[PDB]
Structure 1
């Protein structure tokens, strides 16, 4: 068939967003970009704007490297942490769409525990 398809792993949280493009197997990295080096203040890294910028940069790198199609994999921290993706997940996906990348299957691979470890914060939780 001769089409180079990859996988875009999106790590979305309430503090930062990471976009990482890799080959079909996932063992070879193509482009890794996040909001930390795109924005300046720590409060704007998880912003959808920073998500769009980082996803766009990763898309340009992948296109120059010779990637046309990609399968999305959204991921929240999961485990004992939050189970909900951050604001910069759909923004990153649509930025990848805008940059000129074909999008195949879209899935959430957040690690869900089957009554695993104890979450942080104590029994009373955070009281701010």
Structure 2
């Protein structure tokens, strides 16, 4: 990578990106984006590191994917990131999965500086009707 293909270096401050974590109940996504959500620097998913469909959202897969993403973004010249953790939302579980904390700890122990942390799960001021019926999943 030529230097003009990388962010300008300055001891005054370090380049800041934004990491989007999707902590779903069936998969996990780790997405690094610049300050405006239009330029993608690195994207990885937990399903690229497991062979069983049931372990896609597991913590181990999240850690491996986070390591790969760390390598990529460090190669591309990024040092610090903000965090935006989210769940399914949208009239759904509204609770984080088991891979989010794994990804955060991997980032912390991977030599990355952390900025702000916030919730980004979509919530309605009021909703449509969800699936299941009026008796629910009877099982």
TM range (shorter): over 0.9
Q: Is 1:11 equivalent to 2:22 in the alignment?
A: yes
Larger proportion of helix: 2
Larger Rg: 2
- Give, in whole Å, the separation in 2 of the partners of 1:108 and 1:60: 26
Number of residue pairs matched by the alignment: 128
Aligned pairs for 1:1-128 within 5 A: 1-128=12-139
Q: Deviations over 1:68-116 (max 9, x none)?
A: 0000100001012210010111111111112221111111110111221
- Give, in whole Å, the separation in 2 of the partners of 1:2 and 1:105: 16
TM-score, length of structure 2 as denominator length: 0.87
What is the Cα deviation at residue 118 of structure 1?
Answer: 1.3
- Give, in whole Å, the separation in 2 of the partners of 1:56 and 1:107: 22
- Give, in whole Å, the separation in 2 of the partners of 1:57 and 1:24: 21
What is the Cα deviation at residue 2 of structure 1?
Answer: 4.9
- Give, in whole Å, the separation in 1 of the partners of 2:118 and 2:128: 25
What is the Cα deviation at residue 9 of structure 1?
Answer: 0.1
Contact 1:60 1:99 in 2 (8 A): no
